[PDB]
Structures are given as C-alpha cells and as structure tokens.
C-alpha cells in the first residue's frame, strides 16, 4: 500500500481499479504486444466468436431456434451435435445455391453488410405484417381463425369438416373469426405449415424463390428438433406463448401488451354469427380489404423504411 | 474456369462432409466417454463474464481474517480491547537487544 495519508480515498480506489483493468487487459487481450496470446491453434469461445463473426451469427440463430431461449443463456461451447447439424444444413443450402448459380449466372454470360441488410429488411417486413394484422385483430388469434373471403371461409371450414362456430365484430373489425371444435383446436407442425403455405402460393401462381424456400425448410427442421411441444404448452395459447417468450427489455413490449389486452377484452364480448350471414358480409369485407391493401403500399412510404419504400416502388 | 472452380467447390464440400463424419465419430466414441463429470471443474468464472453479470470486485490485495480486526475502524470507541492495548504497549519500539542476541 502507498505511503499516502489516506489510502482509502476515492482517488486511490479508482486508480487501483483502473490499474487492475489495464493490467488484466495487457495480459489477456489479443494485441500487437501480446503476453498470454501465444501458441494459439484452438481458440476459446470469446476469441473464436470475436475473430469469426460468421460463426457467432449461425451458432446464435441455431441456439434461439433449436432451444427457444434468450441470448443471455448462450452456451460457452456448442455441442458437436449442433455443429454437425449446422454443417449438414450448410451443405444443403450451398448445394441448392450452387446448382441455381450454375444454371443461371453463367448462362447469363462483403457478406456481412449483405446479411445485415437482409435481416433488417426481413424484421421490418414481419413487423409491418404484424402491425397490419393487429390493426384488425388478426395477428395472434387462436384457437380462432381469421377470414376475409368466402374462399378462405370454406378452406378453413374444411378443417373441422363444417363443424364449429363463427364470430363477428361490428364494422370496425374487417374480418370474421372461426372457432373449430375443441378436439381440432390444436396447432400444426412447422413442416406441415410450410408445405401448406408453399402449396397455396404455387396454386395461386406466386412461388417463392428456391433459396428462400430452403431457408423456410431449414427453419422448420430446426423447429421440429424441439420435439412434441415446440411452441405451446398443453393448456396454453399462442398469444400466451408469445407474451411468455417475448423479451422483456424489448421496446415493443408495452405495444404488444396493449394489443393483447384490447384483443382479449374484445373477443370476450364478441358476438356469434352463423355461416350464411357472413358470406354476404365477406363480400364487402373483401372489397374494403383489397382497398386497404392497395392503400398499404402508400402507407409504407409514410413511416416505413427506405428499403420497404424502394422495394414497394 | 467456371467448371473447374465449381468442381473445386464441390470437392471442398465432399472433404467437408468427410471431416464432419470423422468429427462426429471421434466425439461420440472417445470424448463422450472421457468427458469429465463436472465435480472437479474450475472453481471460478472469467472476469469478463463477471463484469457482464455485474459481480466483479477488484480491491483488497490484503484481507482481515477476524471480525475483531474487521470492525476496528467502525467501533470508534474500543478498536482494541484493554488486554490487547496492554499487549500492544510492549511493542512501541523494536528490540535492538533481541536483534543483537
């Protein structure tokens, strides 16, 4: 200890802390004058992820999907099972992409930034879709099913084979909800969901790109890896699961809470309506819904990002 | 050019698949059997993780073992008992006699 009159003074304390940190850094950190960083062939987690930002992203997305969890529980070293599965998925994706490139890019004649832009655009798109649906209380409404056309009504009624009920709300909700039977109020597997979506899109004549399709398929596979209960508990609903898994430090926490509060207090008093009484209503609902969809393109220019604007134009 | 480079990539990925298979085998054969239990793990956490947790302390290169010694500066009235004072009064100076002997 120094021969000063007051070693317990704040100046001394802060000096000791700064010296502590500087010493530990000079000793452990990877620098141009390294002390401990030497004879490195197998790196630890921190240095590995700091040097290879590509692996941190992949190892992190796999962790959040394979195990629905928070980044705060990110493991120090991943399991070899996870690593092998990642390698297999990479092989699949790159095989598809290489075939497509071979057949297109040659007949024609910085990855971090691209990945960042892709992810930003995708999260903006999904946020906009969620907001559009919450505008009419169609975002997360289960066991209910929203409908805006007689075609969709018949399609979703074929689920329960005509059984179930139909509920409505007055002239401010622009869609009608359908309640199947308690035995069929289940949730479907993600592979089945993706297959249904792609089948509907290809029947309508609007197929996704092959790369995006493979992305959806790998996402569904890593979700299947969760097992039986992949999204919800037995006596739990999708909205409860969303509020459960929702990051508390997320800025949209209060927004989602408000939306779900309003949706609950509305569905609690929602009225029942028979089948034929909706189709005639579903006609005008489809009309005003296509009108709102046309307005949506301009609405994106109002507050949407430059990416959404330019992609809409 | 095009064909040769694309075939180079394809064989690179074949080698990758081979490496992955041998990696899986090595792990599930040797390492899953030789893996330590965790009872004798390292009894500490890295300073970076502690700093992120908000748990790191830096000070006290020294320590005070006994509470009698810890609470001296807080008692303000009896930092040392009477017996301890009488014992301390015997070491007001160093003993050059004992040194010499």
């Amino acid at each position: 200890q120094p021969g000063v009159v007051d070693p317990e003074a704040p100046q001394e304390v802060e000096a000791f802390k700064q010296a502590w940190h500087s010493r530990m850094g000079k000793f452990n950190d990877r620098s141009d004058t390294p002390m401990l960083y030497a004879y490195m062939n197998e790196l630890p987690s921190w240095e590995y992820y700091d040097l290879h930002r590509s692996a941190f992203l992949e190892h992190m997305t796999y962790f959040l999907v394979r195990t629905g969890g928070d980044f705060r529980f990110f493991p120090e070293m991943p399991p070899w099972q996870w690593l092998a599965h990642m390698e297999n998925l990479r092989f699949k994706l790159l095989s598809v992409a290489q075939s497509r490139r071979s057949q297109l890019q040659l007949a024609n004649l910085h990855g971090e930034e691209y990945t960042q832009k892709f992810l930003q655009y995708e999260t903006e798109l999904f946020q906009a879709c969620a907001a559009r649906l919450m505008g009419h209380f169609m975002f997360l409404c289960d066991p209910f099913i929203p409908v805006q056309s007689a075609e969709a009504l018949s399609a979703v009624t074929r689920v329960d084979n005509g059984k179930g009920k139909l509920f409505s709300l007055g002239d401010d909700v622009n869609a009608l909800f359908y309640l199947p039977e308690q035995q069929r109020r289940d949730v479907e597997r993600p592979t089945q969901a993706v297959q249904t979506l792609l089948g509907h899109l290809e029947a309508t004549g609007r197929p996704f790109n092959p790369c995006y399709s493979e992305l959806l398929h790998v996402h569904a596979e890593v979700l299947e890896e969760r097992g039986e209960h992949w999204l919800t508990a037995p006596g739990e609903c999708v909205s409860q699961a969303f509020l459960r898994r929702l990051r508390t430090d997320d800025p949209a926490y209060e927004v989602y809470c408000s939306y779900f509060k309003e949706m609950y207090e509305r569905f609690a008093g929602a009225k029942e309506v028979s089948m034929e009484d909706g189709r005639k209503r579903l006609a005008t609902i489809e009309k005003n819904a296509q009108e709102e969809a046309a307005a949506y393109g301009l609405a994106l220019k109002t507050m949407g990002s430059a990416e959404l604007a330019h992609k809409a134009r | 050019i095009q064909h040769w480079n694309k075939s180079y990539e394809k064989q690179v990925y074949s080698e990758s698949v081979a490496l992955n298979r041998t990696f899986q085998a090595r792990n599930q054969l040797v390492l899953d059997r030789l893996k330590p239990s965790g009872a004798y793990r390292l009894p500490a956490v890295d300073y970076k993780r502690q700093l992120s947790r908000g748990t790191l302390v830096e000070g006290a290169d020294f320590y005070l073992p006994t509470a009698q010694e810890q609470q001296r500066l807080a008692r303000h009235f009896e930092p040392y008992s009477e017996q301890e004072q009488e014992e301390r009064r015997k070491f007001r100076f160093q003993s050059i006699s004992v040194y010499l002997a």
Partner: peptide, 11 residues
Amino acid sequence: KPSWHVAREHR
C-alpha cells in the same frame, strides 16, 4: 483482424 470467413481448421 476479425473477418467473415472461417478457415478449414476453425470450421
């Protein structure tokens, strides 16, 4: 020094 590419040894 950080990069977006991973070598064979560090794969």
